[PDB]
Each structure stands twice: as structure tokens, then as C-alpha cells.
Design goal:
The structure holds two protein chains of two kinds. Chain A is built from six helices and eight strands, in the order E-E-E-E-E-H-E-H-E-H-E-H-H-H. In chain A, helix 4 packs across helix 5 and helix 5 runs antiparallel to helix 6. The radius of gyration of chain A is 19 Å and the shape is globular. Chain B is of the alpha+beta class. Classes of the chains: A alpha/beta, B alpha+beta. Chain A: It is found in: Nucleus.
Chain lengths: 237, 300
Amino acid sequence: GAMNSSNYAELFNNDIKLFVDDTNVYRVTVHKTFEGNVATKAINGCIFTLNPKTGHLFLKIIHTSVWAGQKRLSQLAKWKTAEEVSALVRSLPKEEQPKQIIVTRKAMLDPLEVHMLDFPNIAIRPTELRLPFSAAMSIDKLSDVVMKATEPQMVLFNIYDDWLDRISSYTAFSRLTLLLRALKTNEESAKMILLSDPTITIKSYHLWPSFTDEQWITIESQMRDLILTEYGRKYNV
Amino acid sequence: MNTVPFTSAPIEVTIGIDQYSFNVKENQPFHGIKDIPIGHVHVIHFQHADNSSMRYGYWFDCRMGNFYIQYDPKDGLYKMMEERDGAKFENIVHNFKERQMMVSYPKIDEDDTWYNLTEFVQMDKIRKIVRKDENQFSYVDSSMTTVQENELSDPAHSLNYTVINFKSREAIRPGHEMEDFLDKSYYLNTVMLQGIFKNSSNYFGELQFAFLNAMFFGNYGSSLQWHAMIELICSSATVPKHMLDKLDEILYYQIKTLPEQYSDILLNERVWNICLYSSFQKNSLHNTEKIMENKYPELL
């Protein structure tokens, strides 16, 4: 069934599962035409497919060329997502195929389900959690590889860098989602907090700064303060 | 004009024949139904005064033999049986009429209702859905489950409707995932019409049988099956023009015939609102849509 706060710890057991987030698959800018009508221009997008247990990220870049001459693009985006996820599962050795795939938006259930008919034992699930994976394009290196791409391409990352050398999946995921939540509510502040101190660098093979354990504590505290402040501002509480 | 005599009526029961029905009192002298129009299928059905649960009955065609009804006190129900002694049977039938103990199938001559509801229903197809091939008639009741239902127990008592499933390999060609799921024309026309049903009359026939089983016995799996066969048509962009026209007629008499008080369980809100207003064929069911709006605008 659906994933919620109750069955949250199942994410960290030893059943291979993936999250699929499609929010950034079809990205456009809206603009005015010479005659004063509105038009859209597509930019490159990406599917965000993530193993919350291991941190492995399967970043499938969607090139604008895929939309060319197509109608009902926002609907097609869902099926292109499901097509690519299925192909990813097909490319993986059997022992690495997931037992569950969890879609972050319910509109992806039928298209994924349909595309996965060859895999009746992989369960396709919705979720009641309000995960912040749309802010994935706020991570500088992810946005950069997406925007540079000149063709369909798949790029592999570990979204936890080397954290699992020292903390658990559970704690790794709560760090990741707290970081993304803050980037989503106020990107400018969030990124400020991360890069203020020029003496804490991002390894070339990493996505985030090489904070020590204690500096992560201060960082996580700075992110939490950010998210609550924005809440009061939004709601006048 | 044919006759279905009853040996007796030992228990108080509501007897239906087609869309008509009569209250019979315990050990009232009732001994059959006469003037049953030859040329169509029929269904005689029952609801005991004591158990307003389990409606049950028999589909039959009088051209296939002489049938009569007899209450079984061991099994507790009115059974249909075949008399193979022609002479002995006309004998029974004539004496009951002489004594005038039979009701006359009460058909108004202007009325094409039963023909409209059974146009494409054929006994041979019924006996494939209800397999019991030592009888020429077919028993159905409220509680029988379908093949598709059993997959998600006792097969001897199953309704072997054609399995329709929109998220199956059968329904979806590889590489045409999005296309075939949004436009079911290749499932309808190639897989179902040409492939399994062979023609549209057998499809319609099953569709109408499913409906009438829903209506007369409240068989829930039958209602499921009817809805699916409508939805498959309405969700196909490419449908022969003659099927669309016939469907609008078929559905009209089905909607016209439904008891007003039962619209809540028998009509699936989603399928009807999809078919009449969202589907490819939203504009092709003019009579079905008119009568649905004037009679059940709540569901919509």
C-alpha cells in the first residue's frame, strides 16, 4: 500500500527499493511572443531515481529533443518517465532489480504499472509523505550536468557522498530530506548556509561539503531554523 | 406460444418471468406460465418470501425442449427440469390450462422491451458462460462469483465471462504502452472482437447477459462485467459506426428497464461519467445520455 509516517522504517531494510520523482522531467520557461501571446520553451529535465538505503542515484537526463513534435507533453512526460524507469530495471542484473518502486506522485502509478507489466512481482506504490525531491535541481552539480547535456544520458551519483561510512541509512535520508526541504523553501538562504565558510570544500567526487560531524550538527540546526522561519512568514503565525 | 408448467408451489415465493413477476402464496394452486413468446431466451426466477437473500433462476429457450419447475424439499428450492416424454408433457400442459391454473406471460403487443434487452443473447453462448452441459437450461443466483473474481474458489459454480483487464499484457502491446492504454481500439477490435468474440453480436450478447444477471439476481460480478464491456467500447477511439449506434440502443433499454430504486449499486459512477462525458464516444450515446440525465442526474 501507500508509504506514510507509520511504515517509514521499511525504507531502510534490506529489500531493494527505489523512489521515482518525475517533477523535473518536463521543465519549461513561459514567455511572450512577438504578437503578445504566451509560448513555452522546454529545457532539459531529469528523472530522479534513488535507492534510499544505499544512496545510489540514477539520474536520467531528459533532453529537450524528446518533446519535438509531440502533443500533451505534460501527459507524455509521465509515460516517458515510466518508459525510462522500466528500461533501467531491465538493464539491472536480477539480484539488483528492486522489489518495490515508490512514485512520489500518484499520477505516475498507471503509467509505471503499465510499463512494468513484464515485472509483476515488483510492487508500484504511492506515498503519503511530502518528499522534497523537486529541489534536486538546486544541487549545483545535478543542475549542471542536466543543463550541459547534448543528448539522452544517464549519470550515476551517490546522493549521500561518504556519509554512510559514519551514519546510518535512516540518518542519511533524514539529512538529505532536511537539506532538500530547506533548499525548496528558500534556496538562497539554504545555499548560503552551505557555502558560507570557504574553508569547507566539496570533493570533486561529492555533491556536498566535507563537513565534520560537529559542523553537520550546526548545519542541520541552521537548516531547521530556516524552515520554521519561512513557515511563520508564509502563514502569519 | 410455449408453456412452463409447475408441479406445485409448496412455499411462499415471488416468481419472475423475464421482466414480469407474481406473488404466489404457500400451497397456492399455481401450475405454470403459458403463452411464453417463442424466439427469444427467457429467465424464470425466484425469491422466497422467507429469505429475501439469494434470488435464483433459470435461463432457457423453449425451442430446445420441454421444461418444467418442481420444488425440492431436500435442497429447498424450485428446480428446473426437462421432460423428455413429449406426449406426457403436452398432457400435463393441456390439463393445467383446462383447469386454468396458469398465468399468461403478460406481454403488451406494442412492447419490444424483452426483445430489446435480449437481442443478441443466444442460449448456446449462455451455456458456455454457465457450464453445466447435462442441462439445456442454465442456473444463476445472487451469490455466484465470476472467473475473474475467483483469480483475485469452486469452479463448478462460476460465471465464465470473458476476462477484461485494462492493465494486462493482453490489453497492452509492448512499445505501444501509452497508446494502447489511452486508446483501447486495438484491445477491442483485434484482441476481443476479431480474436475472442469473433463478431460484435457475441460481444453484445455477453454484455446483455451480464446486465440482466446483475438486474435480476443482483450478481455483483455480473455488474462488474457489464461495466467493463461498456468502458472498453467507450474508451476506444476507433469503433465501427454500427456498433456505436447499436450500443446506444442497447444501453437505453437497459437504463430504461432498471428499477429506479437500485441505481446506487448497479450503476458505477465513474464508468458512466467517463463514458458519457470524457471518453472518445461521449458524443455517440445520445439516447443513453438523455435518459441517464432525466432519470438519474444525481449519479452524474
